[PDB]
Amino acid sequence: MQKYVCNVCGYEYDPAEHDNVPFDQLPDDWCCPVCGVSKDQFSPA
């Protein structure tokens, strides 16, 4: 499943590590757990 990386801090969201919850299901108020930016500052990776 499509992984995304934080442009600012390099954190990588891998659905497989979160019970197969895809990036597109995360809430509008979700932010990077390392640096706090919103989903719009992530890139497919």
Residues of the binding site: 6, 9, 32, 35
CA atoms within 13 A on the CB side of 44: 4
Q: Stretches 2-10, 12-20, 21-29: which one binds Fe ion (CB under 5 A)?
A: 2-10
Task: Say which DSSP state 18 is in.
Answer: T
> Judged by CB under 5 A, how many residues of this single chain contact Fe ion?
7
Query: Which is closer to Fe ion, CB of 5 or CB of 15?
Result: 5
Q: Which residue has the tokens 């934080």?
A: 6
Tokens of 8: 């600012």
Tokens of 11: 């954190």
Binding flag, residue 4, Fe ion (CB under 5 A)? no
| Residues lying near Fe ion in the complex (CB under 5 A) | 6, 8-9, 11, 32, 34-35
